[PDB]
Design a protein around this ligand. Structure first.
Ligand SMILES: [Cl-]
Ligand SMILES: [Cl-]
Ligand SMILES: [Cl-]
Ligand SMILES: [Cl-]
Ligand SMILES: [Cl-]
Ligand SMILES: [Cl-]
Ligand SMILES: [Cl-]
Ligand SMILES: [Cl-]
Ligand SMILES: [Cl-]
Ligand SMILES: [Cl-]
Ligand SMILES: [Cl-]
Ligand SMILES: [Cl-]
Ligand SMILES: [Cl-]
Ligand SMILES: [Cl-]
Ligand SMILES: [Cl-]
Ligand SMILES: [Cl-]
Ligand SMILES: [Cl-]
Ligand SMILES: [Cl-]
Lengths: 262, 259, 259, 260, 262, 259
């Protein structure tokens, strides 16, 4: 049967829950996960890239801040088509990786965070602030954030709150240079997230001024899961990362094996 | 909503209107425009290449000859879908570029010609089976658009029953390929893209200037001799080599400067 | 008109019928064929690779063993759409290539076998979850086509109910994958492609020769022993490694010669 | 006149003194600095790589921890030969880069640009010889030190190798010790030694480099109370890095492609 | 016996004497000459690049203007060591290449032009104007010119002319943004050239103003081989090219075979 | 202290003593050994390449035929300088690699042969001027070391006055190149490396087997027929193509596995 042309961009929010796990997590990512991934999808993924997270900002834990990276794929077909489940060579993926990322607890005793994998169209749906910004305008602190309203919250209500209450604070903040948003494609993989936003600042101080201090003006919604914006349960209903404009890890173009420092 | 699979090849005819602008324009192209472009379309353009123009031949001005290059994209989706208007980072584009290319005067300019085509030539009119072993080609790519008021079917018939036979009859001409421009994509005023190969510039001139003198001047002619169309407005062209080193998705490594 | 999005993987079984032809065939493949091919399909083939065959195993001749390589393409559109027949530059193709590969005798031919598949295996029949860390594979890729007049459903039933269970039972076999050939694309006489992994040639022989002796000879058999099909006409194969250096769209840098 | 074949590895310790500068510094490094650099030295530098620093560990400030990266060059000739001063195209280098790296204080003390030349091969292998990549991920702590003015270099060397290295050797958390003398003849670098000291992770680093080092006596020349006893960023610099970098610039750079 | 470490940069001035030869010449260079060359010297040449010439400027013929390109190598050893004469595979080199480049004259296809292959140190020896210029300062029209004084002229006399009379005009011209020079290594291959200069302008009009109009003030030297500057026999005693800052033909890095346009 | 500029080409002759070891050995070479090696010497090795051997020809066993590959390095400094013994990361090297290559039994062990040479052949003894346009070569690279007690000058004279003339006389032999091994580097037992080109395996056999029967057996002979030297201990060889896809500093992109 036919395969549907379904061009999409996806984002995975990859945390590292202790600095002691960072070397092992990073090794697995770059030594094992890259080649396993390229091996599988080279023919129908046009871009596969990692954007390391900037250092977690103050109060970033409240925004489900991914301490390792954003992982980005651009697909030509849906990875969730059941026909794609069959692979000659499966990826090497031990449960330790889930520990390092905080999806499971480290050691048996006798609180895990979900794997958030959000599919989007390849083009942002809403260009809300900063249209026409070029790279010549300077370095961006790009805060990418995904949010999913809690169970029982009417999605249209949440949408209206986001666009009529939250975004206007971003608009008013001269520190914020760009606001972009897309609806998550929920029909692909059942992701609990509803929106992905990207909100740019000059720097971490700008991010804090706007996302912590200016947001104190919002009323706390009745559905709030924490006392302050984003009012959503960290890592479950909100995830985020701040990233640079450029990554060296444009993996289909730039990977040459796991060469080690002398 | 869905995005339509629309594989296409497009050509842009990039002029340079003064030799004094060449270094500036070339810098912008290779230093600024390449990375902005790749950044935007890497996920849905499978090839992005520049073919620098050979030196403008004698009378080339009358064919809307692009003195810089042909820019070539191979798209998997239509770049003119309105959803594709949104971009996180927009291209760095000094208005001087439009002066360099002749779109606006320094103080009528020539239009920006961006023609979409199917990926495969629609008509193979001379030289089927030619291989690269057959030798180096002087490849003359030309796009034409009939003036307002000219019936497109009339124009087509003229092109294929009067112009193409002169190409076919010339031993100097080794290949003739043609496609209709996909007018539905972006409103391009061109109607056809032809590619016409010669051994060399002398061959090009022999056929495109001397042999074409036998044509009758059409009633809609905008200039006295073939192509009978307003240079840069209703005809644009470039002569290029078989190979370019600027296969930009594969070969670009940053703007490295000479020592 | 539109072009259909048709993601496919194809395999070509490339033999070398005499060791004396190896240097010449290998030169054409790597010096001439690669650049001609990339030139034609770069915009719509996302992967183009050669997997050189391991040395022919004992009795491998009975399996139509390709003594040069498997050639693998990943297509976004069907290469057999008649619009794709037109090419600016055709491939340089000496008729001797056909002699080297055995399609024509040098002064009975074997057919050129070019099988199109979906990009993902349709059937995972042994070894699901095997990773590269589990060790090196001897990957025996085999394509079969039942003879004229054999009901395709009865061949399929034999394959999956008689042959595959022997593979499933053998500890020497670590993986069994299978897909139906897309016969609508190019009229390929093959019906299935299977890939069957072993640790090594000895394992392959134990299973594909010794264990298969237990099969009853089908009424339609074209040879006495499994695969019961005419070598190179109704069965072709190769054993290959997990990795190839010849991932051509990514890795090719011209025909650089040893010093 | 002839040019001397002088194969060397150099290290530059690149700080980032405020998180607010990180985007600008990183952009300049990757967008501006890489192509300028490759333009100049492609014909006589065989490797040019950046190793981004892991997050600064607790007390890392006392070690002159480079919060951006280590910059690594492998040279075939000396960059300090006076003939190499002439270049067709000079680097684009705005003053602000010096603020972002902390060489100039923002409008309390500036820190020096530390650029240490070494032989390409480590001179001393003091622990963990034979370790392979199969043995696991390393937290590689690279540290350069330079004894204060007035301290006899041989006395400093004796202290380093007779007092400090034994503590590293005693710790099972330390898996590797390597050292080379700095080639001070090349560019007058104040540093005297570069060591690389491997751990499994930041907690192992801390246990050894902070807790175990408490056993050392404070030298009479100490510039701070605890090990390394040297003035941060002036007489000691360091970074913890991974085994692998994607920024192997002569092989891997394809221009400054921006996220969509 | 030992091989001497001899880092050098060399330049070859490649002409195309008729436009009708351009497709053939360009094809041989990129389809045949690149792979033959890389095959031979990959282990001891660290950079191999072509800089295509800008369009020949008015009166450029008088400067021995190379209408195809400059070919540039960076060597670690001297290519003229006799031990390097032996090669497993020799280059494919039709005599027609010599016709296309002008080494064999049209007269039977009066005088051919020599193959000029100048070895230099890797670093310019003299920085005569524009020290400190960066790429941010703007696009350069880089006029690279080599000169060799006629037989009979004392090299010190020629050097004195060059510095007393020519260099001051270059330095004084506001249109000239950079002047660099090196002495040709005369001990490598017998090259008849004595100097390589590179002289930058904004554009061809600036090149003309200085190299044609400002040079009209010069007295004709007793040894002149033509009536106006450079006073040297085009293509025999002077060769040149105007080139851009950047080339896509950085062959050791960027070459992927002779891929043809569709 | 200074490091000496010492440009050299080295060759390692890599055997695979059983076909059952081929997948394992090949995997270690390409998955493990490439990255460890590039990691160590990227800054001072300008080329690192593998030339897979053509199928072992008849009687190739008597020439110490390397059934896996030639491994070729171009060095800027001597790898045997004692300062180069120190490495941050040592190569991952399972003892089984010694078994696969035949240095130890799972038969007498065979030594690791690592011959250093100048980067340029010292002697050009037939075929000077041959280009790649002349056609595909079957390149037989052979290294020999005279047995203990044989005067090296005597061996040299026999090589160049008795053996090489037979190669030169044969129309089947198109090229003969030789260099003396740099024995001061690593104490290699080999004395000479020769490369001897043919059109194909049949030509190789005609010359190296049949034509060589005319030689008198030397008094120091270790086997009855040419090469008269102990296979794998005093002679090693491989036949290889002009081109390899395994030009490892340029072409390696990690161990990507077939789908
Ligand atoms: Cl919930
Ligand atoms: Cl509110
Ligand atoms: Cl709370
Ligand atoms: Cl009109
Ligand atoms: Cl007419
Ligand atoms: Cl049949
Ligand atoms: Cl049927
Ligand atoms: Cl049965
Ligand atoms: Cl039979
Ligand atoms: Cl001090
Ligand atoms: Cl102490
Ligand atoms: Cl001409
Ligand atoms: Cl003269
Ligand atoms: Cl004068
Ligand atoms: Cl004159
Ligand atoms: Cl012996
Ligand atoms: Cl004899
Ligand atoms: Cl014997």
């Amino acid at each position: 049967a036919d395969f549907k042309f379904e061009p999409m961009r996806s984002l995975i929010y990859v945390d590292c829950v202790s600095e002691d796990y960072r070397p092992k997590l990073q090794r697995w990512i770059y030594k094992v996960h890259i080649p396993d991934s390229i091996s599988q999808f080279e023919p129908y993924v046009t871009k596969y890239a990692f954007y390391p997270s900037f250092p977690i900002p103050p109060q970033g834990d409240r925004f489900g801040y991914a301490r390792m990276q954003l992982t980005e794929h651009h697909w030509l077909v849906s990875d969730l088509d059941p026909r794609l489940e069959i692979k000659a060579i499966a990826e090497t993926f031990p449960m330790d990786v889930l520990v390092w990322q905080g999806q499971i607890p480290a050691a048996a005793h006798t609180e895990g965070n979900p794997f958030i994998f959000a599919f989007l169209p390849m083009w942002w749906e809403k260009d809300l602030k900063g249209k026409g910004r070029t790279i010549e305008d300077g370095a961006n602190y790009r805060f990418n954030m995904t949010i999913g309203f809690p169970e029982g919250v009417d999605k249209a209500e949440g949408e209206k709150w986001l666009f009529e209450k939250v975004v206007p604070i971003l608009q008013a903040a001269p520190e914020c240079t760009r606001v972009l948003a897309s609806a998550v494609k929920k029909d692909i993989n059942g992701c609990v997230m509803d929106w992905v936003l990207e909100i740019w600042f000059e720097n971490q101080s700008g991010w804090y001024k706007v996302m912590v201090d200016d947001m104190k003006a919002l009323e706390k919604p009745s559905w709030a899961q924490q006392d302050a914006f984003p009012f959503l349960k960290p890592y479950h209903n909100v995830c985020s990362a701040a990233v640079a404009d450029y990554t060296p890890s444009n993996n289909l173009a730039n990977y040459r094996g796991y060469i080690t420092m002398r």
